Amino acid sequence: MTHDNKLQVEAIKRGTVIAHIPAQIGFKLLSLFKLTETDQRITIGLNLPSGEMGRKDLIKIENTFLSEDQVDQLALYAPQATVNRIDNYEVVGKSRPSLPERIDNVLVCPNSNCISHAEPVSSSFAVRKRANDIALKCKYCEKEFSHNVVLAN
Amino acid sequence: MTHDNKLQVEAIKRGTVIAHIPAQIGFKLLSLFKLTETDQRITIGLNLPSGEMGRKDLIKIENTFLSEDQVDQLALYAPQATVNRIDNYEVVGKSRPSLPERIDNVLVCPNSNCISHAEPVSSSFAVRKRANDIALKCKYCEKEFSHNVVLAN
Amino acid sequence: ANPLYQKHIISINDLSRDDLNLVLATAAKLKANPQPELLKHKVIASCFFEASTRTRLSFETSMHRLGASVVGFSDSANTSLGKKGETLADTISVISTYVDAIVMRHPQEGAARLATEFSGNVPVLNAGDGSNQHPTQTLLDLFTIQETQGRLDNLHVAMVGDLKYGRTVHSLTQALAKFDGNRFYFIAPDALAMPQYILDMLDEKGIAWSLHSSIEEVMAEVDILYMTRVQKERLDPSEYANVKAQFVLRASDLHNAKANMKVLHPLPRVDEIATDVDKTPHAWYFQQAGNGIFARQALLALVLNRDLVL
Amino acid sequence: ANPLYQKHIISINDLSRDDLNLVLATAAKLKANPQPELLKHKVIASCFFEASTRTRLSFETSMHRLGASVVGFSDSANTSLGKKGETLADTISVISTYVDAIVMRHPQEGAARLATEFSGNVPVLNAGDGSNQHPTQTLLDLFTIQETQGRLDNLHVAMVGDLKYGRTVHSLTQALAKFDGNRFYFIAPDALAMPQYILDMLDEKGIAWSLHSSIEEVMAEVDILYMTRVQKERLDPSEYANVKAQFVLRASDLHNAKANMKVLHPLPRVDEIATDVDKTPHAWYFQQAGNGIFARQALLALVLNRDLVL
Amino acid sequence: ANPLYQKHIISINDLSRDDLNLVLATAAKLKANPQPELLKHKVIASCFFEASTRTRLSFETSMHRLGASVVGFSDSANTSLGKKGETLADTISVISTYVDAIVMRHPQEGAARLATEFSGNVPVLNAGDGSNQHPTQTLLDLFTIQETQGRLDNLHVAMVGDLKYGRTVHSLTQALAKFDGNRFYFIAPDALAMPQYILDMLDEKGIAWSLHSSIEEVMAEVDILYMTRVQKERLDPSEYANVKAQFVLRASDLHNAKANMKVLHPLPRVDEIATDVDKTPHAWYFQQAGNGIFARQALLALVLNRDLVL
Amino acid sequence: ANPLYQKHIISINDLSRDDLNLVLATAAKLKANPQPELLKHKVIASCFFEASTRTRLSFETSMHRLGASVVGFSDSANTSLGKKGETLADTISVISTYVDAIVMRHPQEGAARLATEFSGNVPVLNAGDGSNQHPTQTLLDLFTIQETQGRLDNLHVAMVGDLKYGRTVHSLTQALAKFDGNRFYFIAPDALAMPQYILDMLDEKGIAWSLHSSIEEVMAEVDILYMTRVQKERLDPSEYANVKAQFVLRASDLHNAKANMKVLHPLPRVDEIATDVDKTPHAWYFQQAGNGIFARQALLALVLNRDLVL
Ligand SMILES: [Zn+2]
Ligand SMILES: [Zn+2]
């Protein structure tokens, strides 16, 4: 939690905490998933001294807890990152990100001739884990690509 | 410049603390100028209690020093923000966002027939201040527009 | 015989408040109890000289709802005869023999009126003449407005967009300034003001119409927000951009509006009406959009049918 | 209510073997005893955003066979609205009000799926989305295959031509690998192999599919020779010529085939299927071609109708 | 090194006062003693992405009168690429490796501005760029007002027609304002109004202007009558009509205009200046055309050369 | 009489080794001391039956740099005749009675080959001819590999993109194979594979090559990186996608390529070489363009002349 060192450092109140977030994907989550848009005090810690685990990003989401659904959503951008529920200045629940079935509206069907590109619809793909390498099936065009492909978009 | 001594604010030895930003601008900044696009120790405190501005956005960044320039760009959004350049736990001195005469690569010419649109070229805006608004000329289609219309949503 | 029997439906001006009210009363009855074989055996040609797909699928969907057979054409791809060389006169003359009625749409103005001359004694109904008229829209317009506030009077109708050119704000204005106490506020660009002659006839009645720079200048005091589309052509793109969001209506703007306030717009919208608006209860366009099937039915019913014992 | 009542008919994958079998059982009953007023009063719009004349004359011929009224459009000549500017969303939204159902065809993939979202609760049936789906063909495909060997299992289906791109060999494969013991031989150019993912799901069932260089490499051991068209574009003309006759099927080649072996092909053929083949008893295309009127009827019958007391 | 040496003529504002005289000083010289070999071996690209035959001919004829070879084309839709991959940035970069001067025209504002940052060390002359600029035409117009009248400061310049979208007026008015004493009479329809910017600047520089109802009130007062084509396209057939009759110049009206009074027009005249006008010496729009051959000659001649006994 | 004198440059195979050097030797000379009067009085027909602005401009600019006049045109559908009677055989026979060199381009393979047997004693340069040849481009490419590297034998030439239908690759590979030591790395999608012919010959001549998964494995090994545009058109939107990401060259990848390493591309680049590439000295596709002005200059210059102090 607290990247303490030798001075006064601030913590939160009752919120979800995500650490050991592969450095550089915190902002992405922040942007992408859009948890940034709130009147609740957030605190972030990009590029942190994880010494052995190099660096990490970190999102101390105050007064807010994430549904184990959302938690899962992390997986491709911050899989090993932990989301600990901290109530009353303490980890009531250490939570780890599992892989879901469907990925809602943060992804982009690389299919140019799709319809999802031009319209008022929210991206949805089916995650079919294969030999621990992912394939993502667009719910519209019915084309299936890999995770690496749709992650460049 | 706010000392919540229950969850005291951490002090970085030197770098750049961008304190006093109205809410929802801080992150808007993280992208707009690309401040996360560094492997440095950055600190994002968002929606902070300051009686003088309700929620304040705050951006500490280790050992980085913005020139008189990046400061000056902030103008368009975070105008009350103060860049307090730090060094050795104390401030070398404060800095305020002077309104510039140009704004490159970050805006988009409102003009739907502005070539800038389909081409490999940064938006460049000549910026003259006037009466009840800032007006900015495209470097390309050449049309004047208000800041109110160019930097909208 | 019912007032509008065998009549021609050409221009809104040409229907009186008593009239509108019949078709308005009728369409409504129709809405509840259908008469799927009312115009059975009858045949109507659709003559969309300037194709408007939905408007065609609407007259046609009304046509088929009373079991009426349909022949016709649309957007003369390129050189279909009855265009160059062949005068629309001679072309109304011929169809007037095969068909029991005629609904048409056309590029030049008055076309329908002319049609009426060689129409013989076969009913014609203008469904789009030039920048002149488009009554059928107006009907499904107020059939919709009436359906939301059971009255065509005491109304504060907001008419945003390109008032100037739009051919439906003028008539709807006309129509509405035939019922009482209609307060019309006009949200429009300097470059796209109302077309005065509408105004003068408005003052001649002595009707209220406060001009407006922003929608939030009426937002509270409104019922039927009628929003039309402004078009690129009739305004330099930089100027288009200049305004752009000056008259686009967002749902956030709807935090102000009345309970029963409903936003209407002939369709299609695109830059003007946002989707958050689609979901909020004031969104009614697709509803005015399906309502016209009944305003349409009615007109067709009253015209081909003698006595409307509905 | 009958399983497919009010359902959406979009992708073959989305129908299970029990399903196919109902519509298959139904169309068949239909074939014998018509119900020319089954969908009377009902109205269906045809929305061929990418005109396929025969496919339209087929849905439409089915539409009129149960006495159903029809409104619609096809190949938007050039700039018909609901194209640029107007989103197909808003355009499904509006028709969903006038019509009782919707059959459409479209250039981009998934279009139908999307349609389903704004369709409201009005049935939509994809009749051609992108290089994705075209279920209705598949149905009249197996309604035809079943009609020739009273079973969708124990079959050795030969699928020649451009397997790779053709959007009907993949589904028919899919469909067929839902019934048992289906041996699929694949006659195709190196440059136009099967699209693997079809293969993998095939092996996942553990189905048989011996790849083939020549048709005479299966010619004897076959029932449903399904032949598709290869296209110029996707292969240099010299290469087109290079192969040309490598996969064209002549009638002489049919001196080998089984009694009950029937050659099918969605149509049209041209260079692939010779006319001597037309005359020989294995020619059945125009038969699968008129059969789809019944596979089509059925789907329409089960979807708009509650209980199929045929 | 003359000033205009190696400089891209992109827009009127980047040309000072001194600048324009050195352009006007030249052409007056080349109209007297022309230098047919002064640009030999020079190849010039004439790249008309937007089609403009009349400007193209003047531009290429101008090159030819000085010795250059010319290569070029008209319309991207009449080019090899465009939307099919090639970008502007890349075409210019390439072309910028053959020729010594790119003169281009464009459907978009800024292409010129941008090409100048891709062309490498090749100067780029703007034949056109959307609603934006058009240097040569204006450089010319001035040179024609200078010749006819003998001066560029202290004039009674009246502009007429579509002041609003008028790309050439906004260019001439800014250049004239670089000089002193001028007064500008503005006589255009209320809708096709001179935009506010020009105005606002007109008064930053404290320059005399004033709006007018017709040319009746000013006919004498004026020296130069820059005419401009109005547009039914800009208006509406019926709109166009009611005002068009307010802005046609008959020979009769020149009636009592000063001996020095001249009439200008960027051409194509088409309703405005009626034919009886041409016989009056006040007519000078053709005389104005023949001048761009010197207008443009001067530019090209200055851009690529350094010294001149001109 | 130099060798290439009066010879029609129809295709790469009829050019020996000596042949290409005498072409490469020339241009290197004309890039140093250019002869602006060396082809005066010469009129050349530039006959672009297929539209190719970029090749047209280079070709005509090349003529102009040597003194010839030029006359020509673009597209038969933009000519007087074609399908309406006139034959190729006859147009050439006629035209072959004005000009001294026909340079043509064509939608069909062989037009060049054929024109050479109609043109009479007029030499005929092939700007293009269907899937077939394209001499000048290649003659050029070599001259650009010779200049950048200093040699044409013993290279680490890697080709990338659409090797299959790639008209320019098949031409460059054959010419390089006329020289010794070269090795060819092939990195293209399994479908857009280098055709077998080239291969088969590649090994008749016992030349070193090998197929590769990406440019990762070879980035250093190579000296010259001839890039080529892949094609969604060749693939299928979804197909295109899965592999396109396998063949884009970022500046990052040049990462650790030899100091001499160069990047080539016939242009229009459009996805492959991303823009960050251009700032690296390894970028040389524009430098390559400016060279065809010498490539082609040499040809024309050799074809019509006999002696040269070149
Ligand atoms: Zn998709
Ligand atoms: Zn711009």
PDB file of N, CA and C in Angstrom, chain C residues 175-232:
ATOM      1  N   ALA C 175     -49.812  26.412 -39.064  1.00  0.00           N
ATOM      2  CA  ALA C 175     -50.759  25.514 -38.407  1.00  0.00           C
ATOM      3  C   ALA C 175     -51.013  25.914 -36.980  1.00  0.00           C
ATOM      4  N   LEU C 176     -49.934  26.091 -36.242  1.00  0.00           N
ATOM      5  CA  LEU C 176     -50.117  26.467 -34.879  1.00  0.00           C
ATOM      6  C   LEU C 176     -50.710  27.865 -34.685  1.00  0.00           C
ATOM      7  N   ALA C 177     -50.482  28.765 -35.619  1.00  0.00           N
ATOM      8  CA  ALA C 177     -51.090  30.062 -35.426  1.00  0.00           C
ATOM      9  C   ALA C 177     -52.497  30.076 -36.080  1.00  0.00           C
ATOM     10  N   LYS C 178     -53.249  28.992 -35.832  1.00  0.00           N
ATOM     11  CA  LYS C 178     -54.650  28.793 -36.276  1.00  0.00           C
ATOM     12  C   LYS C 178     -55.447  28.340 -35.008  1.00  0.00           C
ATOM     13  N   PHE C 179     -54.706  27.921 -33.980  1.00  0.00           N
ATOM     14  CA  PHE C 179     -55.262  27.501 -32.697  1.00  0.00           C
ATOM     15  C   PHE C 179     -54.849  28.627 -31.769  1.00  0.00           C
ATOM     16  N   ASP C 180     -55.472  28.729 -30.601  1.00  0.00           N
ATOM     17  CA  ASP C 180     -55.144  29.876 -29.753  1.00  0.00           C
ATOM     18  C   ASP C 180     -54.013  29.891 -28.733  1.00  0.00           C
ATOM     19  N   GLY C 181     -53.618  31.120 -28.387  1.00  0.00           N
ATOM     20  CA  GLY C 181     -52.554  31.368 -27.409  1.00  0.00           C
ATOM     21  C   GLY C 181     -51.221  30.687 -27.640  1.00  0.00           C
ATOM     22  N   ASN C 182     -50.816  30.599 -28.895  1.00  0.00           N
ATOM     23  CA  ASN C 182     -49.568  29.928 -29.171  1.00  0.00           C
ATOM     24  C   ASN C 182     -48.317  30.824 -29.167  1.00  0.00           C
ATOM     25  N   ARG C 183     -47.528  30.625 -28.126  1.00  0.00           N
ATOM     26  CA  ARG C 183     -46.314  31.378 -27.955  1.00  0.00           C
ATOM     27  C   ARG C 183     -45.155  30.642 -28.632  1.00  0.00           C
ATOM     28  N   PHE C 184     -44.565  31.269 -29.658  1.00  0.00           N
ATOM     29  CA  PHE C 184     -43.458  30.664 -30.400  1.00  0.00           C
ATOM     30  C   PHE C 184     -42.112  31.339 -30.174  1.00  0.00           C
ATOM     31  N   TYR C 185     -41.177  30.648 -29.555  1.00  0.00           N
ATOM     32  CA  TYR C 185     -39.854  31.244 -29.369  1.00  0.00           C
ATOM     33  C   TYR C 185     -38.932  30.788 -30.509  1.00  0.00           C
ATOM     34  N   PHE C 186     -38.178  31.716 -31.121  1.00  0.00           N
ATOM     35  CA  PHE C 186     -37.310  31.353 -32.274  1.00  0.00           C
ATOM     36  C   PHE C 186     -35.796  31.332 -32.151  1.00  0.00           C
ATOM     37  N   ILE C 187     -35.254  30.149 -31.814  1.00  0.00           N
ATOM     38  CA  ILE C 187     -33.811  29.958 -31.585  1.00  0.00           C
ATOM     39  C   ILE C 187     -33.049  29.846 -32.868  1.00  0.00           C
ATOM     40  N   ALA C 188     -32.456  30.942 -33.329  1.00  0.00           N
ATOM     41  CA  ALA C 188     -31.770  30.879 -34.612  1.00  0.00           C
ATOM     42  C   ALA C 188     -30.619  31.823 -34.928  1.00  0.00           C
ATOM     43  N   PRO C 189     -29.713  31.323 -35.771  1.00  0.00           N
ATOM     44  CA  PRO C 189     -28.528  32.070 -36.204  1.00  0.00           C
ATOM     45  C   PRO C 189     -28.981  33.318 -36.943  1.00  0.00           C
ATOM     46  N   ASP C 190     -28.207  34.383 -36.820  1.00  0.00           N
ATOM     47  CA  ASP C 190     -28.489  35.633 -37.501  1.00  0.00           C
ATOM     48  C   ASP C 190     -28.677  35.262 -38.959  1.00  0.00           C
ATOM     49  N   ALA C 191     -27.740  34.447 -39.448  1.00  0.00           N
ATOM     50  CA  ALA C 191     -27.709  33.951 -40.828  1.00  0.00           C
ATOM     51  C   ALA C 191     -28.851  33.041 -41.217  1.00  0.00           C
ATOM     52  N   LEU C 192     -29.721  32.699 -40.270  1.00  0.00           N
ATOM     53  CA  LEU C 192     -30.825  31.800 -40.563  1.00  0.00           C
ATOM     54  C   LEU C 192     -32.020  32.138 -39.696  1.00  0.00           C
ATOM     55  N   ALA C 193     -32.456  33.369 -39.837  1.00  0.00           N
ATOM     56  CA  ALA C 193     -33.589  33.890 -39.090  1.00  0.00           C
ATOM     57  C   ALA C 193     -34.867  33.334 -39.653  1.00  0.00           C
ATOM     58  N   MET C 194     -35.991  33.769 -39.095  1.00  0.00           N
ATOM     59  CA  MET C 194     -37.271  33.323 -39.594  1.00  0.00           C
ATOM     60  C   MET C 194     -37.445  34.040 -40.934  1.00  0.00           C
ATOM     61  N   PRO C 195     -38.351  33.576 -41.781  1.00  0.00           N
ATOM     62  CA  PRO C 195     -38.570  34.243 -43.077  1.00  0.00           C
ATOM     63  C   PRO C 195     -39.675  35.326 -43.005  1.00  0.00           C
ATOM     64  N   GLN C 196     -39.499  36.318 -42.125  1.00  0.00           N
ATOM     65  CA  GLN C 196     -40.420  37.457 -41.954  1.00  0.00           C
ATOM     66  C   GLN C 196     -41.875  37.307 -42.346  1.00  0.00           C
ATOM     67  N   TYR C 197     -42.143  37.024 -43.610  1.00  0.00           N
ATOM     68  CA  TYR C 197     -43.508  36.881 -44.074  1.00  0.00           C
ATOM     69  C   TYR C 197     -44.264  35.927 -43.166  1.00  0.00           C
ATOM     70  N   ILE C 198     -43.532  35.031 -42.511  1.00  0.00           N
ATOM     71  CA  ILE C 198     -44.148  34.118 -41.543  1.00  0.00           C
ATOM     72  C   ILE C 198     -44.454  35.014 -40.335  1.00  0.00           C
ATOM     73  N   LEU C 199     -43.449  35.791 -39.943  1.00  0.00           N
ATOM     74  CA  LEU C 199     -43.557  36.703 -38.825  1.00  0.00           C
ATOM     75  C   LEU C 199     -44.745  37.650 -38.952  1.00  0.00           C
ATOM     76  N   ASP C 200     -44.821  38.367 -40.085  1.00  0.00           N
ATOM     77  CA  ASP C 200     -45.874  39.358 -40.330  1.00  0.00           C
ATOM     78  C   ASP C 200     -47.295  38.811 -40.169  1.00  0.00           C
ATOM     79  N   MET C 201     -47.538  37.646 -40.753  1.00  0.00           N
ATOM     80  CA  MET C 201     -48.813  36.967 -40.645  1.00  0.00           C
ATOM     81  C   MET C 201     -48.979  36.562 -39.165  1.00  0.00           C
ATOM     82  N   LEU C 202     -47.859  36.363 -38.478  1.00  0.00           N
ATOM     83  CA  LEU C 202     -47.892  35.979 -37.073  1.00  0.00           C
ATOM     84  C   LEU C 202     -48.357  37.220 -36.270  1.00  0.00           C
ATOM     85  N   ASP C 203     -47.741  38.372 -36.529  1.00  0.00           N
ATOM     86  CA  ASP C 203     -48.123  39.575 -35.810  1.00  0.00           C
ATOM     87  C   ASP C 203     -49.530  40.011 -36.184  1.00  0.00           C
ATOM     88  N   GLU C 204     -49.911  39.683 -37.417  1.00  0.00           N
ATOM     89  CA  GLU C 204     -51.224  39.999 -37.946  1.00  0.00           C
ATOM     90  C   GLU C 204     -52.300  39.264 -37.133  1.00  0.00           C
ATOM     91  N   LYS C 205     -51.932  38.109 -36.598  1.00  0.00           N
ATOM     92  CA  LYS C 205     -52.863  37.395 -35.758  1.00  0.00           C
ATOM     93  C   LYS C 205     -52.687  38.118 -34.448  1.00  0.00           C
ATOM     94  N   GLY C 206     -51.433  38.385 -34.132  1.00  0.00           N
ATOM     95  CA  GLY C 206     -51.112  39.049 -32.888  1.00  0.00           C
ATOM     96  C   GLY C 206     -50.729  37.899 -32.003  1.00  0.00           C
ATOM     97  N   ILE C 207     -49.711  37.163 -32.448  1.00  0.00           N
ATOM     98  CA  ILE C 207     -49.204  35.990 -31.753  1.00  0.00           C
ATOM     99  C   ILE C 207     -47.840  36.329 -31.249  1.00  0.00           C
ATOM    100  N   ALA C 208     -47.477  35.660 -30.161  1.00  0.00           N
ATOM    101  CA  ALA C 208     -46.220  35.853 -29.442  1.00  0.00           C
ATOM    102  C   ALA C 208     -45.046  35.031 -29.916  1.00  0.00           C
ATOM    103  N   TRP C 209     -43.939  35.696 -30.214  1.00  0.00           N
ATOM    104  CA  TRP C 209     -42.793  34.960 -30.673  1.00  0.00           C
ATOM    105  C   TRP C 209     -41.467  35.570 -30.302  1.00  0.00           C
ATOM    106  N   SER C 210     -41.045  35.360 -29.067  1.00  0.00           N
ATOM    107  CA  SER C 210     -39.760  35.907 -28.581  1.00  0.00           C
ATOM    108  C   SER C 210     -38.482  35.278 -29.212  1.00  0.00           C
ATOM    109  N   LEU C 211     -37.732  36.039 -30.022  1.00  0.00           N
ATOM    110  CA  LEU C 211     -36.498  35.533 -30.662  1.00  0.00           C
ATOM    111  C   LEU C 211     -35.439  35.143 -29.634  1.00  0.00           C
ATOM    112  N   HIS C 212     -34.747  34.051 -29.911  1.00  0.00           N
ATOM    113  CA  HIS C 212     -33.748  33.555 -28.992  1.00  0.00           C
ATOM    114  C   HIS C 212     -32.408  33.145 -29.567  1.00  0.00           C
ATOM    115  N   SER C 213     -31.395  33.555 -28.822  1.00  0.00           N
ATOM    116  CA  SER C 213     -30.014  33.294 -29.118  1.00  0.00           C
ATOM    117  C   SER C 213     -29.592  31.904 -28.634  1.00  0.00           C
ATOM    118  N   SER C 214     -30.058  31.505 -27.458  1.00  0.00           N
ATOM    119  CA  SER C 214     -29.719  30.185 -26.937  1.00  0.00           C
ATOM    120  C   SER C 214     -30.957  29.387 -26.530  1.00  0.00           C
ATOM    121  N   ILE C 215     -30.849  28.066 -26.551  1.00  0.00           N
ATOM    122  CA  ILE C 215     -31.987  27.273 -26.134  1.00  0.00           C
ATOM    123  C   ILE C 215     -32.231  27.474 -24.627  1.00  0.00           C
ATOM    124  N   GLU C 216     -31.164  27.588 -23.838  1.00  0.00           N
ATOM    125  CA  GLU C 216     -31.291  27.811 -22.394  1.00  0.00           C
ATOM    126  C   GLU C 216     -31.965  29.139 -22.024  1.00  0.00           C
ATOM    127  N   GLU C 217     -32.486  29.816 -23.046  1.00  0.00           N
ATOM    128  CA  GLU C 217     -33.197  31.102 -22.972  1.00  0.00           C
ATOM    129  C   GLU C 217     -34.697  30.820 -23.112  1.00  0.00           C
ATOM    130  N   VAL C 218     -35.087  29.609 -22.776  1.00  0.00           N
ATOM    131  CA  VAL C 218     -36.486  29.229 -22.989  1.00  0.00           C
ATOM    132  C   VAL C 218     -36.702  27.862 -22.354  1.00  0.00           C
ATOM    133  N   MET C 219     -35.578  27.132 -22.373  1.00  0.00           N
ATOM    134  CA  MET C 219     -35.442  25.814 -21.798  1.00  0.00           C
ATOM    135  C   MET C 219     -36.441  25.471 -20.729  1.00  0.00           C
ATOM    136  N   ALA C 220     -36.631  26.350 -19.752  1.00  0.00           N
ATOM    137  CA  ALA C 220     -37.615  26.045 -18.700  1.00  0.00           C
ATOM    138  C   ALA C 220     -39.016  26.143 -19.222  1.00  0.00           C
ATOM    139  N   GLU C 221     -39.397  27.233 -19.841  1.00  0.00           N
ATOM    140  CA  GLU C 221     -40.761  27.608 -20.203  1.00  0.00           C
ATOM    141  C   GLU C 221     -41.296  26.958 -21.442  1.00  0.00           C
ATOM    142  N   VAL C 222     -40.842  25.749 -21.694  1.00  0.00           N
ATOM    143  CA  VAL C 222     -41.215  25.083 -22.931  1.00  0.00           C
ATOM    144  C   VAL C 222     -41.937  23.710 -22.895  1.00  0.00           C
ATOM    145  N   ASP C 223     -42.642  23.386 -23.993  1.00  0.00           N
ATOM    146  CA  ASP C 223     -43.321  22.089 -24.145  1.00  0.00           C
ATOM    147  C   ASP C 223     -42.711  21.382 -25.386  1.00  0.00           C
ATOM    148  N   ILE C 224     -43.100  21.815 -26.590  1.00  0.00           N
ATOM    149  CA  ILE C 224     -42.596  21.156 -27.791  1.00  0.00           C
ATOM    150  C   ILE C 224     -41.386  21.807 -28.385  1.00  0.00           C
ATOM    151  N   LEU C 225     -40.235  21.277 -28.002  1.00  0.00           N
ATOM    152  CA  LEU C 225     -38.975  21.736 -28.567  1.00  0.00           C
ATOM    153  C   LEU C 225     -38.909  21.072 -29.966  1.00  0.00           C
ATOM    154  N   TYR C 226     -39.073  21.856 -31.021  1.00  0.00           N
ATOM    155  CA  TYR C 226     -39.003  21.352 -32.393  1.00  0.00           C
ATOM    156  C   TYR C 226     -37.647  21.744 -32.877  1.00  0.00           C
ATOM    157  N   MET C 227     -36.822  20.758 -33.173  1.00  0.00           N
ATOM    158  CA  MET C 227     -35.463  21.036 -33.613  1.00  0.00           C
ATOM    159  C   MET C 227     -35.231  20.596 -35.056  1.00  0.00           C
ATOM    160  N   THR C 228     -34.793  21.487 -35.931  1.00  0.00           N
ATOM    161  CA  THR C 228     -34.568  21.087 -37.311  1.00  0.00           C
ATOM    162  C   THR C 228     -33.070  21.023 -37.594  1.00  0.00           C
ATOM    163  N   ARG C 229     -32.699  20.689 -38.823  1.00  0.00           N
ATOM    164  CA  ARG C 229     -31.274  20.579 -39.120  1.00  0.00           C
ATOM    165  C   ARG C 229     -30.746  21.794 -39.848  1.00  0.00           C
ATOM    166  N   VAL C 230     -29.535  22.213 -39.536  1.00  0.00           N
ATOM    167  CA  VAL C 230     -28.968  23.324 -40.277  1.00  0.00           C
ATOM    168  C   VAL C 230     -28.118  22.599 -41.342  1.00  0.00           C
ATOM    169  N   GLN C 231     -27.899  23.187 -42.515  1.00  0.00           N
ATOM    170  CA  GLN C 231     -27.118  22.497 -43.556  1.00  0.00           C
ATOM    171  C   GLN C 231     -25.850  23.236 -44.001  1.00  0.00           C
ATOM    172  N   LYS C 232     -24.769  22.452 -44.134  1.00  0.00           N
ATOM    173  CA  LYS C 232     -23.442  22.907 -44.554  1.00  0.00           C
ATOM    174  C   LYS C 232     -23.451  23.945 -45.691  1.00  0.00           C
TER     175      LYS C 232
END
